[PDB]
Amino acid sequence: MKKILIVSFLGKGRYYETFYYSIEHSEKMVKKRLSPLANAILEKENGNDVEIIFFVTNEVKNEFLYDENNEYAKNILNELNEIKNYGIKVSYRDIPKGKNYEELEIIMEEIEKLLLDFKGNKVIFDLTHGLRHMAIFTSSTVFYFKNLMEKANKLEMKIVYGAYEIGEEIEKNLKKVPILDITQTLELSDLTIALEEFERYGITERMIIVLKNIQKIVAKNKLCNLNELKFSSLSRELKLFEELLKIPSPPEKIANSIYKINDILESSIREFKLCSNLFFIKPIQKFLVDFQKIVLEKLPLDKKINKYSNIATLEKVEFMKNIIKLLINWKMYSEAVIHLRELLIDIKLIENGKYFYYNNKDFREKYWMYKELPKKIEELLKNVKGWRNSVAHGGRANTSINQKTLEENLENALSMIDEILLSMKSKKIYLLNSTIMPIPKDNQGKFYILKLTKNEFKVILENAIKDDVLDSAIGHESVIEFIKDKFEPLKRKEYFEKGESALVIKLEMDFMEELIGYYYIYREG
Amino acid sequence: MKKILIVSFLGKGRYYETFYYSIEHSEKMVKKRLSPLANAILEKENGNDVEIIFFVTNEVKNEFLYDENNEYAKNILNELNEIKNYGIKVSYRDIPKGKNYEELEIIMEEIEKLLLDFKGNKVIFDLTHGLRHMAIFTSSTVFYFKNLMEKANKLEMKIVYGAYEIGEEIEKNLKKVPILDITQTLELSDLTIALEEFERYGITERMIIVLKNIQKIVAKNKLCNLNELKFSSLSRELKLFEELLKIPSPPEKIANSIYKINDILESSIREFKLCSNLFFIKPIQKFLVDFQKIVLEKLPLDKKINKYSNIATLEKVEFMKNIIKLLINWKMYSEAVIHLRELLIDIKLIENGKYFYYNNKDFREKYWMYKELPKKIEELLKNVKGWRNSVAHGGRANTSINQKTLEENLENALSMIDEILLSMKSKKIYLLNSTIMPIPKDNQGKFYILKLTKNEFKVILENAIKDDVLDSAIGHESVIEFIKDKFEPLKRKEYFEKGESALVIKLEMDFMEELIGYYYIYREG
């Protein structure tokens, strides 16, 4: 059971008898004079607690209602008196006619105080009766009232009215009138609110709430199924994406989240296309189209990054370039600086070929500190290090910076990184088949090893193939069988000099599928 | 000159002749039949380009308008024909009656396409004529239309209508009717939009725009003056505050910005109180009250911090504690971690008495690295350093963290810092009167010096006074005269051992006012 308040006005009129039905359920028709009474009856038949409050004016009640020789007035009076028999609560509230902005302010205060004093679950504005003036003003003010009382009462709010001008006419002056429900117009502007919030700041609160509401209302009528709706999944993924961005995280999870967002977005849009109605379909289709526009605009896609999670590549460099640009756009400056540092680390790993230890931090530091392109990269390094510590150290000791000069410095970094990225367009690498450290017998050694995936394996393998720098050392045959069966020189010779890099694999083939590239190995000593 | 589009419906009716006036200017009255025509005339008398578009239905125009034996219909037809003589552009647009949600969607599309095809400056929805149905639906949908076309047309939008039900009656069926302007209801919910944005994220865009609009509309009627309105100043200060928070900055500027915000807020509220109207005063008074509530809630005040900008104190520690709590609340996690590091630096400076060099960074680092309370502070240090580098280094090398464990760690730091702050409740300090380095003649020396303000001078001076640790060395008399005349032992003896700390001042007294405490001096060698 829910507790419910119906708010209507009450103006001079003929108040003909009407067959009100909810346009959702044309089955239940209630023949009454007041639309609020019909709505109250439809709600008490749902086992709820319902109360109606009318706003009357002195000009109306001591000139129309209690005029005993106005047939329409006594008709509506008799109905207002028999309202109490159905189990519904009726009361009256004096207001002015609203002839100026001061009186309209008074009316706003009256409605606002009523909503504050309501202690139930739902409130319905029934705009059927009263002045056209009052109906228009209330319709305009309802959204303000909801936004006001989001943090006040936690109250559900509906806007309905009997659209008697579009009602069927069954007998003389007798009309079949639908109680239209325009409450969907309230959360029509919340859509654009979410759009601005995400487009300018990347905030998902409005987006998550709106998506949950959208999935509810598309689940109203069950013609549309799941396995491709997954708006719950899309809202959860947006939550994860915000947690990943405002808390800095590796490029792999960010690229995966962007790929997931794109996949779920297009899948859910295609699914939603086939649902033919009972509410406003077009605005939310426009909403999804606009959100897909912004997603494909501001979120950089690279569908095939997740396959290189253990190393540092140039694709990750450009991806983080676009990510930092996005972070700057959303005014997320600190996170942008933090990501820039690691992007520079990755670039110098690429430029120095030390990219095996993108999962080791001691190496990251040791080359955080210790032929022109080296000189240009040093140019960029010195530029960036010239201003990073103002952001990093919080500006203490008289060394802070405004947004203008920070924007200056960030676009400096952007320009130089795009420069050197466009400008960046192979020792002996043996080929092994097991995890080993065979050092020459006269050596006194330090060795690094890293787990890999199959794609990286293939890439560096053909790099060794067609740079003449491959010293292949496969000793048996079925290895080559799987090599050409999967990946598209059997020099069976036993040595590892400090510095040489090599590749490894350890164990028809379907069973196997049920490891194929890993354990890249290099002697730093 | 502006280009203007008036949009109205056109329904069956008697269309009596009416004296329309703008309620702002009751001087100009226009006697016509259609409120849109009166509005168009009032706008062309302003030297603008005006066009009216009516939405008619087949049921209305081929059953009412061109019925040549309906007197009201031919009256309104003659007026619609003479509209072209005033220099105004009239056109018709077919729509359904809107008997269901599909047809209402159609109507929304029609209005939306009209607003997209408009290439002028202003659009006015005149809700005087047409169905009550259509007026209600349009009034509800206008805010959605504005939010939609914020990024589409950059179009000013007004909602007006002739409130003929509240019009004076001057002669038989002849009414003096005001064209009411409820456009202020559109930007009534934008107020709460700004409130949520600031209260949950600290975004000032909506706040700045709303404050600028507020100052415009309070400048409509000039009863309220400046020197205490300064809503322009408040918007600028909010912009500065956001730039100070999302780009980490010293506590001094943050405390100054909070003090400025509070001062301008209360000053502007008191000033706004005296303006008696022409628009809705109450909602924006509620807006200012709510924003002051949130300001005094989430922004910690300390009116008397700016006086200690050169040193590190405990007040700054608690202030930054509250600031980091606020940063956590606004989901600004990276900036919160960065501020926490410097707060810990300040705490250990307090605990080790090395607080002279809050404006020197080498010292900050050298004690960033190198009796129980020391042990508890080391507890907190080790805790915080155990997880800072996950945030600092971007989570590379498989060392990231979710929001849940980061919240865990941040509240760990919060609890321990409040602990040790509650738990924290003096060598020989000579007194000098000039900048000097007199080392004993047998010494081989390094000396630090810092400019100060007068309040810090007074504080440490009485600390030396009543800890018995003052070796005062004032050699002459007028120094003591100014000492007791301003601040409320003349041991004229010449030495500075490495480690002793001392105070200095250099040059009736009003002229002077037109330096009083500075150059605190200490030998680290």
Side-chain angles (χ1 to χ4, degrees), chain B residues 10-23 25-26:
Chain B
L10 199 73
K12 302 200 263 291
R14 303 214 257 272
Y15 289 99
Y16 284 130
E17 277 219 281
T18 303
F19 287 54
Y20 302 97
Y21 55 98
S22 174
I23 200 163
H25 313 96
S26 55

mmCIF file of all heavy atoms in Angstrom, chain B residues 10-27, unseen atoms left out:
data_model
loop_
_atom_site.group_PDB
_atom_site.id
_atom_site.type_symbol
_atom_site.label_atom_id
_atom_site.label_comp_id
_atom_site.label_asym_id
_atom_site.label_seq_id
_atom_site.Cartn_x
_atom_site.Cartn_y
_atom_site.Cartn_z
ATOM 1 N N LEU B 10 -4.006 27.734 -32.854
ATOM 2 C CA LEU B 10 -5.191 28.457 -33.304
ATOM 3 C C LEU B 10 -6.357 27.484 -33.247
ATOM 4 O O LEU B 10 -6.463 26.591 -34.095
ATOM 5 C CB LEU B 10 -4.997 29.016 -34.711
ATOM 6 C CG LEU B 10 -5.934 30.151 -35.120
ATOM 7 C CD1 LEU B 10 -5.538 31.428 -34.402
ATOM 8 C CD2 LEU B 10 -5.913 30.355 -36.625
ATOM 9 N N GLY B 11 -7.229 27.656 -32.250
ATOM 10 C CA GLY B 11 -8.337 26.758 -32.028
ATOM 11 C C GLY B 11 -9.670 27.479 -32.151
ATOM 12 O O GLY B 11 -9.739 28.711 -32.227
ATOM 13 N N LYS B 12 -10.738 26.681 -32.189
ATOM 14 C CA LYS B 12 -12.087 27.230 -32.250
ATOM 15 C C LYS B 12 -12.353 28.104 -31.031
ATOM 16 O O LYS B 12 -12.003 27.749 -29.903
ATOM 17 C CB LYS B 12 -13.116 26.099 -32.319
ATOM 18 C CG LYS B 12 -12.936 25.157 -33.499
ATOM 19 C CD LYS B 12 -14.208 24.380 -33.810
ATOM 20 C CE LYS B 12 -14.162 23.004 -33.162
ATOM 21 N NZ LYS B 12 -13.146 22.124 -33.812
ATOM 22 N N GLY B 13 -12.977 29.252 -31.256
ATOM 23 C CA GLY B 13 -13.262 30.158 -30.159
ATOM 24 C C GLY B 13 -13.946 31.405 -30.665
ATOM 25 O O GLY B 13 -14.104 31.616 -31.872
ATOM 26 N N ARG B 14 -14.355 32.239 -29.709
ATOM 27 C CA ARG B 14 -15.061 33.469 -30.038
ATOM 28 C C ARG B 14 -14.119 34.621 -30.358
ATOM 29 O O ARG B 14 -14.499 35.521 -31.119
ATOM 30 C CB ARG B 14 -16.006 33.843 -28.896
ATOM 31 C CG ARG B 14 -16.990 32.730 -28.579
ATOM 32 C CD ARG B 14 -18.341 33.263 -28.149
ATOM 33 N NE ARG B 14 -18.530 33.186 -26.706
ATOM 34 C CZ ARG B 14 -19.023 32.124 -26.081
ATOM 35 N NH1 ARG B 14 -19.377 31.034 -26.745
ATOM 36 N NH2 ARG B 14 -19.164 32.156 -24.761
ATOM 37 N N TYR B 15 -12.905 34.603 -29.805
ATOM 38 C CA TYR B 15 -11.848 35.568 -30.121
ATOM 39 C C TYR B 15 -12.332 37.008 -29.944
ATOM 40 O O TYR B 15 -12.347 37.808 -30.879
ATOM 41 C CB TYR B 15 -11.313 35.349 -31.539
ATOM 42 C CG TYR B 15 -10.481 34.099 -31.705
ATOM 43 C CD1 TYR B 15 -11.039 32.943 -32.226
ATOM 44 C CD2 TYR B 15 -9.138 34.078 -31.349
ATOM 45 C CE1 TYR B 15 -10.289 31.799 -32.383
ATOM 46 C CE2 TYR B 15 -8.377 32.938 -31.503
ATOM 47 C CZ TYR B 15 -8.960 31.799 -32.022
ATOM 48 O OH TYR B 15 -8.219 30.649 -32.186
ATOM 49 N N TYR B 16 -12.741 37.327 -28.721
ATOM 50 C CA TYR B 16 -13.194 38.678 -28.427
ATOM 51 C C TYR B 16 -12.022 39.654 -28.527
ATOM 52 O O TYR B 16 -10.851 39.276 -28.427
ATOM 53 C CB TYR B 16 -13.830 38.740 -27.036
ATOM 54 C CG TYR B 16 -15.232 38.162 -26.964
ATOM 55 C CD1 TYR B 16 -15.574 37.234 -25.987
ATOM 56 C CD2 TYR B 16 -16.216 38.556 -27.861
ATOM 57 C CE1 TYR B 16 -16.852 36.705 -25.913
ATOM 58 C CE2 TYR B 16 -17.496 38.030 -27.797
ATOM 59 C CZ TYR B 16 -17.807 37.107 -26.821
ATOM 60 O OH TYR B 16 -19.082 36.585 -26.754
ATOM 61 N N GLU B 17 -12.346 40.924 -28.745
ATOM 62 C CA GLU B 17 -11.308 41.939 -28.853
ATOM 63 C C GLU B 17 -10.787 42.305 -27.470
ATOM 64 O O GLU B 17 -11.556 42.449 -26.515
ATOM 65 C CB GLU B 17 -11.834 43.177 -29.577
ATOM 66 C CG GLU B 17 -11.778 43.024 -31.090
ATOM 67 C CD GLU B 17 -11.357 44.293 -31.796
ATOM 68 O OE1 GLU B 17 -12.209 45.193 -31.960
ATOM 69 O OE2 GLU B 17 -10.171 44.387 -32.187
ATOM 70 N N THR B 18 -9.471 42.455 -27.368
ATOM 71 C CA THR B 18 -8.807 42.562 -26.080
ATOM 72 C C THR B 18 -7.764 43.669 -26.108
ATOM 73 O O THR B 18 -7.058 43.842 -27.106
ATOM 74 C CB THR B 18 -8.149 41.226 -25.713
ATOM 75 O OG1 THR B 18 -9.142 40.193 -25.718
ATOM 76 C CG2 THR B 18 -7.477 41.291 -24.355
ATOM 77 N N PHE B 19 -7.678 44.414 -25.006
ATOM 78 C CA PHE B 19 -6.618 45.400 -24.802
ATOM 79 C C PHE B 19 -5.451 44.696 -24.120
ATOM 80 O O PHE B 19 -5.376 44.618 -22.893
ATOM 81 C CB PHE B 19 -7.119 46.584 -23.982
ATOM 82 C CG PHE B 19 -8.044 47.503 -24.732
ATOM 83 C CD1 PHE B 19 -9.173 47.018 -25.369
ATOM 84 C CD2 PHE B 19 -7.783 48.863 -24.793
ATOM 85 C CE1 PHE B 19 -10.019 47.868 -26.062
ATOM 86 C CE2 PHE B 19 -8.628 49.719 -25.482
ATOM 87 C CZ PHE B 19 -9.747 49.220 -26.116
ATOM 88 N N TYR B 20 -4.531 44.172 -24.927
ATOM 89 C CA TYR B 20 -3.327 43.550 -24.399
ATOM 90 C C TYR B 20 -2.281 44.598 -24.052
ATOM 91 O O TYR B 20 -2.015 45.515 -24.834
ATOM 92 C CB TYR B 20 -2.739 42.562 -25.399
ATOM 93 C CG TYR B 20 -3.662 41.446 -25.814
ATOM 94 C CD1 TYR B 20 -4.402 41.525 -26.987
ATOM 95 C CD2 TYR B 20 -3.772 40.297 -25.045
ATOM 96 C CE1 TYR B 20 -5.235 40.492 -27.374
ATOM 97 C CE2 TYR B 20 -4.601 39.263 -25.418
ATOM 98 C CZ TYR B 20 -5.331 39.363 -26.584
ATOM 99 O OH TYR B 20 -6.160 38.330 -26.960
ATOM 100 N N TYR B 21 -1.684 44.454 -22.876
ATOM 101 C CA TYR B 21 -0.534 45.249 -22.475
ATOM 102 C C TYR B 21 0.503 44.321 -21.875
ATOM 103 O O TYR B 21 0.162 43.323 -21.237
ATOM 104 C CB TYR B 21 -0.889 46.309 -21.440
ATOM 105 C CG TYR B 21 -1.569 45.739 -20.218
ATOM 106 C CD1 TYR B 21 -0.844 45.465 -19.063
ATOM 107 C CD2 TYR B 21 -2.923 45.429 -20.231
ATOM 108 C CE1 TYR B 21 -1.451 44.930 -17.946
ATOM 109 C CE2 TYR B 21 -3.541 44.901 -19.117
ATOM 110 C CZ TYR B 21 -2.801 44.649 -17.979
ATOM 111 O OH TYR B 21 -3.413 44.116 -16.868
ATOM 112 N N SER B 22 1.771 44.657 -22.074
ATOM 113 C CA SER B 22 2.813 44.005 -21.299
ATOM 114 C C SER B 22 2.717 44.494 -19.861
ATOM 115 O O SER B 22 2.667 45.702 -19.609
ATOM 116 C CB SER B 22 4.192 44.303 -21.881
ATOM 117 O OG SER B 22 5.217 43.783 -21.049
ATOM 118 N N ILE B 23 2.677 43.553 -18.914
ATOM 119 C CA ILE B 23 2.512 43.921 -17.513
ATOM 120 C C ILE B 23 3.672 44.776 -17.022
ATOM 121 O O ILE B 23 3.533 45.494 -16.025
ATOM 122 C CB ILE B 23 2.330 42.655 -16.648
ATOM 123 C CG1 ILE B 23 1.688 43.012 -15.304
ATOM 124 C CG2 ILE B 23 3.657 41.941 -16.453
ATOM 125 C CD1 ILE B 23 1.104 41.820 -14.569
ATOM 126 N N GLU B 24 4.823 44.716 -17.702
ATOM 127 C CA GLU B 24 5.926 45.619 -17.384
ATOM 128 C C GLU B 24 5.599 47.049 -17.798
ATOM 129 O O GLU B 24 5.800 47.991 -17.022
ATOM 130 C CB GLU B 24 7.208 45.142 -18.066
ATOM 131 N N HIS B 25 5.079 47.231 -19.011
ATOM 132 C CA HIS B 25 4.717 48.548 -19.537
ATOM 133 C C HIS B 25 3.212 48.569 -19.784
ATOM 134 O O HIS B 25 2.745 48.263 -20.886
ATOM 135 C CB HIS B 25 5.494 48.870 -20.812
ATOM 136 C CG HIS B 25 6.958 48.583 -20.716
ATOM 137 N ND1 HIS B 25 7.515 47.408 -21.173
ATOM 138 C CD2 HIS B 25 7.980 49.318 -20.221
ATOM 139 C CE1 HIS B 25 8.819 47.431 -20.959
ATOM 140 N NE2 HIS B 25 9.127 48.579 -20.382
ATOM 141 N N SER B 26 2.450 48.943 -18.755
ATOM 142 C CA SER B 26 1.017 49.130 -18.928
ATOM 143 C C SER B 26 0.691 50.337 -19.797
ATOM 144 O O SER B 26 -0.467 50.492 -20.200
ATOM 145 C CB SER B 26 0.337 49.258 -17.564
ATOM 146 O OG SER B 26 0.920 50.294 -16.793
ATOM 147 N N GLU B 27 1.679 51.187 -20.087
ATOM 148 C CA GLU B 27 1.463 52.327 -20.972
ATOM 149 C C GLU B 27 0.996 51.868 -22.347
ATOM 150 O O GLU B 27 -0.084 52.247 -22.814
ATOM 151 C CB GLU B 27 2.747 53.149 -21.084
#
